Design a protein around this ligand. Structure first.
Ligand SMILES: [Ca+2]
Length: 223
């Protein structure tokens, strides 16, 4: 997250870190057994880390649970990032508590102009590299479909939305991929892509979770 703030330990209790020997992507806990992340975060050998604040210090509220299954969307296209969504099943259910909690799936799609909370352990520099240890947060508004398509001509599908600031300076970034975009208390987006981070005229692009709720529900009813 570039241009964000330190969230505060465990104030984003649905945020997970995906670890394969090191943090490599975020995700969102949607119930005690399942995490939503980006398909482009797929790796074999994922351990889900819940209850994290500093990902390099064991502070006492973590739960580390291996994935038993990962399910990339059936129509994910890694070239365009259309349908950039994945489900990860935990080998054992998380113990839900004040620091480890699920986020609701949406019923309706979010509205342009809605301010959403985006979080992660990704790079904090637009130019260069610095990865934080503690979880960072950003409030960013959803941009109109027409502004998103103007920013990335020929690249935005109906399964993507843009959020952020066209002047630059505030965005998600590498290492935040797969993590949450929460708007009005529902998981509306997944950190997916963008040109650089926090560059002028190049807002973040996010997987539109409200298009996937029936897939998510049928898949979790069956696995
Ligand atoms: Ca920790």
């Amino acid at each position: 997250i570039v241009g964000g703030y330190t969230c505060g330990a465990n104030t984003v209790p649905y945020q997970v870190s995906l670890n394969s020997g090191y943090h490599f992507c975020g995700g969102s806990l949607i119930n005690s057994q399942w995490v939503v992340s980006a398909a482009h975060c797929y790796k074999s050998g994922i351990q889900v880390r819940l209850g994290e604040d500093n990902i390099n210090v064991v502070e006492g509220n973590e739960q580390f649970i291996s994935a038993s299954k990962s399910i990339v969307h059936p129509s994910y296209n890694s070239n365009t990032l259309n349908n950039d969504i994945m489900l990860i099943k935990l080998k054992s259910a998380a113990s839900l508590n004040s620091r480890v909690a699920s986020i609701s799936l949406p019923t309706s799609c979010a509205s342009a102009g809605t301010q959403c909370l985006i979080s992660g352990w990704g790079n904090t520099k637009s130019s260069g590299t610095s990865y934080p240890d503690v979880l960072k947060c950003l409030k960013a508004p959803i941009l109109s479909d027409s502004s998103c398509k103007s920013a990335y001509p020929g690249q935005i599908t109906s399964n993507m939305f843009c959020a952020g600031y066209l002047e630059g300076g505030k965005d998600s970034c590498q290492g935040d991929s797969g993590g949450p975009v929460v708007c009005s208390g529902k998981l509306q987006g997944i950190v997916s892509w963008g040109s650089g981070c926090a560059q002028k005229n190049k807002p973040g692009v996010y997987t539109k979770v409200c298009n996937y709720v029936s897939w998510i529900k049928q898949t979790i009813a069956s696995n």
